[PDB]
From a paper:
Human ornithine δ-aminotransferase (hOAT; EC2.6.1.13), which belongs to the same evolutionary subgroup as GABA-AT, converts L-ornithine (L-Orn) into L-glutamate-γ-semialdehyde (L-GSA) while also producing L-Glu from α-KG. Aminotransferases are members of the pyridoxal 5′-phosphate (PLP)-dependent class of enzymes. The PLP moiety links to a catalytic lysine (Lys) residue through a Schiff base, forming an internal PLP–Lys aldimine structure, which can specifically react with an amino acid substrate to produce a keto analog while forming pyridoxamine 5′-phosphate (PMP), thereby completing the first transamination reaction. Consequently, hOAT has emerged as a potential target for developing effective treatments for different types of cancers; therefore, we are interested in determining the mechanistic differences among compounds that inactivate both GABA-AT and hOAT for the future design of selective inactivators of either GABA-AT or hOAT as potential therapeutics.
We further carried out co-crystallization experiments to explore the final product of 5 in hOAT. The acquired crystals diffracted to a resolution of 1.91 Å. The most well refined molecular model had three monomers in an asymmetric unit in the C121 space group. The biological assembly of hOAT is a homodimer. In contrast, the apo-hOAT peak is the primary one in the sample treated with 5, while only a small portion of hOAT was covalently modified by 5 (middle). The conjugated structure of the noncovalent form explains the maximum absorbance at 460 nm. In the case of noncovalent inhibition by 5, the ligand is located 2.8 Å away from Lys292, resulting in the additional translational freedom for the carboxylate group to anchor with Arg413. The unique binding orientation of 5 also led to a water-mediated hydrogen bond interaction between the imine group of the ligand and Tyr55 residue. The co-crystal complex also reveals for the first time that, in both the minor covalent and major noncovalent forms, the carboxylate group of 5 establishes unusual salt bridges with Arg413 rather than salt bridges with Arg180/Tyr55, as was previously observed in all the co-crystals of hOAT with other MBIs.
Author numbering:
A (entry chain B), B (entry chain A): 38 to 439
The structure:
Amino acid sequence: PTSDDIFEREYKYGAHNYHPLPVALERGKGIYLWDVEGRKYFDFLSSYSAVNQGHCHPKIVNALKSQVDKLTLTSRAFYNNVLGEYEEYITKLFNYHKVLPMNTGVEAGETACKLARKWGYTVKGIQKYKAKIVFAAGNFWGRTLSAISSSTDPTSYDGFGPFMPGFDIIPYNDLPALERALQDPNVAAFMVEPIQGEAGVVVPDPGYLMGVRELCTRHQVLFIADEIQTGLARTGRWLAVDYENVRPDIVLLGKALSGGLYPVSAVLCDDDIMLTIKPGEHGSTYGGNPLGCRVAIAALEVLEEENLAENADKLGIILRNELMKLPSDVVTAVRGKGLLNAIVIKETKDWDAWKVCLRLRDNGLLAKPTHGDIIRFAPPLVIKEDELRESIEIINKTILSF
Amino acid sequence: PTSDDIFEREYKYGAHNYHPLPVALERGKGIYLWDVEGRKYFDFLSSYSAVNQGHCHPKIVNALKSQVDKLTLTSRAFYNNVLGEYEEYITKLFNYHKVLPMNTGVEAGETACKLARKWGYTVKGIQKYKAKIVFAAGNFWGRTLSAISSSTDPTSYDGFGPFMPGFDIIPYNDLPALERALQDPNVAAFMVEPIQGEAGVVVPDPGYLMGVRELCTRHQVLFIADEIQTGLARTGRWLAVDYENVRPDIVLLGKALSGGLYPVSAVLCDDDIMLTIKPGEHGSTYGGNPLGCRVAIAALEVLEEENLAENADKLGIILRNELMKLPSDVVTAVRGKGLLNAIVIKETKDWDAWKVCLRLRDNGLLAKPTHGDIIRFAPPLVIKEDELRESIEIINKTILSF
Ligand SMILES: *[C@@H](c1c(COP(=O)(O)O)cnc(C)c1O)[C@@H]1C[C@@H](C(=O)O)CC1=N
Ligand SMILES: Cc1ncc(COP(=O)(O)O)c(/C=C2\CC(C(=O)O)=CC2=N)c1O
C-alpha cells in the first residue's frame, strides 16, 4: 500500500469535499507524523488544533483503553458513573455552573445558538421567533446549514439553499459595528472567535474582547466565545479570552478537549442560561457518553500537568520572532498568539502558498494554506525548543528556496 | 459512589436537557448492563439502536485498541491509510459509488440536505434559493436548528428562534400526500425513515416504500432514506428498505455503524449526486478519522459474521407474537420489524408508560417511553432466544402486576 494507492482509493470511493495535501500518514506520536513509506514529518497543523497534547498521548490512550472494556454508550436515557465526574471536573475547571456535552464543534455551536434563542424568548423577553444572533465576518464554526448561514465565505454557503433567518453578520474587530448591531433589542447573542482560526489566524486589536464584553453586558446580549480552536492552551492560556480577563456568557470547547482520541465538545454556561432548556428539548445520541468523558478528563489533565499553556506562550514568542526575520517581498504578515500562528504569502503568479506547503512537505514539515495565501503554523504544544528550532530552519530554508 | 450520588452530581453540574430513567450504570456486556450497586439488567433500548452488536463487543474493542496506539486524527487536510479502506468496504457493502463520512447522525442528515439542495440547483436546475425538501410528520433526525425546523414535535422546536425555510411537511405513510407535494418542481428531495423510530416505531403499510421510490423517480426528486436507527440488521435486514427491495438515492447510516464505541455516521450515494460538492465545500474536523474508521469496519464485520439480521428477523417475530398475548385492556397496540418494536399503553390513573418502565427496571429490564404512552423494546441483536424469552417474561410480570 503506497501513498499513491491511498490517494487513488479515496478518490474512487470517498466524496471529493476535501482536497488534501498529497501525503498519506499511517502513524503519529507527539509532534511527529509518519507516512506509509516511513518518512517523518513535523505536524504544523495539529488537526486544526485538535491534537494540542500531541498524537496518541499515552495518558489519554490509557484512559480510553481503561474505559472501553467497561462501558462505552448508554445514551443519556440512563445515567452512568462517568458523565457526572467529568461534568464536575470541567465546570469546576472553567468556573461555570453547568456543561452541556456534545460531540463535534458545530454541534456545540448549534447548542449555543439554541440556548441564546431560548434565553432570548424566556428571559430577555423577545417576541417569539424575532430573536437575532450576530456573528463576525470571517467566522467559521462548522458546516451545518445553520453554520454556513453565518459565513461570508462563498465556498461555504453558495448552492446550499435558503439560509437560516435571524443570523446577522458584522465586520470582525469592529466595536462600533457591534454597538450598532446591539441597538436592536431583539438581538439575543453575539458569537465570536477570540482569534479567527479558519480565516487565517486573524488576531483582533488589544481591547477588542474587553469591548465586546462591555457592549454585550450593556445591551443585555449573550457573549458566546467560540474557543473550539483557540482554547485549551493553544494560544498560551486556558482560554484565549484570558489574555484580556474577559468572561463570556457561553464558552464553546471542542477539538483538543479529547486530544484527538474522540469527538467531544462542550457548552459551558451558568444556570440562568443553561436551564432555559428543559428535559427532552435538546440532545444527541453520543453526547456525554462514558468513553468520550474519560478521554476528556485525561486530555484536560494533560494540559494542566504538563504546563502546556506556558510552553505555548514562550515558544510562540520564539517562533513569531524568527518568522518576522523572513524577507517581506515574500512574507508580508506574521501574526498569532502562543502556538496558533500564521504567515501571509505574497502570491505572485509565479508561486503560492500551496507550492510552499508542497515544498515544506518535501523537507519534512506539514502545513496547509487557508483562503489561498495564508500558511498556518500550529504544532502540538508538547514541542520542545530544540524541535521548534529545527522546524524553524526547515521553514526558513524552504521560504528562501523560492 | 451510589446511584443517588450519581443522580445528584449530574443534577448539579450537567445541563437538564434529559430526564433519564433513574438507573446508574457502570458496566455493559452484550445484552446486559450493571449498575453501581451491582444489579443486572437486560438492555431493551440499545442506546437507540447504537449498540446492535451488544455492549463492548470484543472484535470492535480490539479494533479500537489496535488503532488508538498508531494514529487517531490527522484531519482530512491530509490522507491517512485507513479512511480509503473503510470507504471501499462500506461502499461495496451497500452498492453505492461513494460515501461522505461524518460523526453524528444529525450531521449525516444535514449533509444529505446540503447534497439535495446543491443537486437541485446544479443538476435539476432549480432557481437559487427555491429548493425544497419534503419531510414526513413525526420525523426525528437530530437536534440542530435545521432538524427541528422540519419537526412536528413542539418539544423539539418550541422556543428555538426562527426556523429554516424551504422544508415542507406531509403525513407519514401517505402516498397521495407525497404525490400532491411533489407537484411542485422546486422540490429537490423527500427525506424519510423506513420506520419512524422516535415517533414510536411507526411502521408504514406494505408497499409505502415502493410507492415513495416510484413517486420520487416519476417527479425527479431525491429519495433520502434515514436508516440511522432502522439500518444495520436492527429490523432484520442490512437496510429496512431491503424489505421492499427499494434503492434510495441517498442513504444515511449512523448509531450502530460503530457498535457504540465511536461516533461515526455516513452518507451513501452515487457520483451524480455526491460530486455536486466540490473540494472545500463541506467537511468536519473528526469526519473520517482513522480511529472511527477502524471501529466502523469491525462493527460492520460483526453484523455480517454473526448473522445478526436473520437473528433479529426470527427473534422479532417471537417477541411480537408474545407481546400480542398481553391484555388489550393495558396494551392497545404492538408493532415493529425485526428487533425494533414497541407497545402502546392505555393511560389510566393507575398506570402510565413511565410507571411501567420504572417497574420494568425494578424487575431487571431497561426500557424508556417515548411520546408519553409508547414503550420501545429494542435489545441488542446478539441476544439469544432463551434470553429473549426470559426478557419477555419480565415484561409479562411487569404488565400483569398492574
Ligand atoms: C473547526 C471549528 C469548528 C467546527 O468544529 P467541528 O468540525 O468538530 O464540527 C467550530 N469552531 C471553530 C473555532 C473551529 O475551528 C475547524 C476550523 C477550520 C480551519 O481551517 O481552521 C476547519 C475546521 N474543521
Ligand atoms: C433516524 C435517526 N436519524 C438521526 C438521528 C440523529 O442522530 P444523532 O443523535 O445526531 O447521532 C437519530 C437519533 C436519535 C433518535 C432517538 C429516539 O428516541 O429514537 C434519540 C436520538 N438521539 C435517529 O434515530
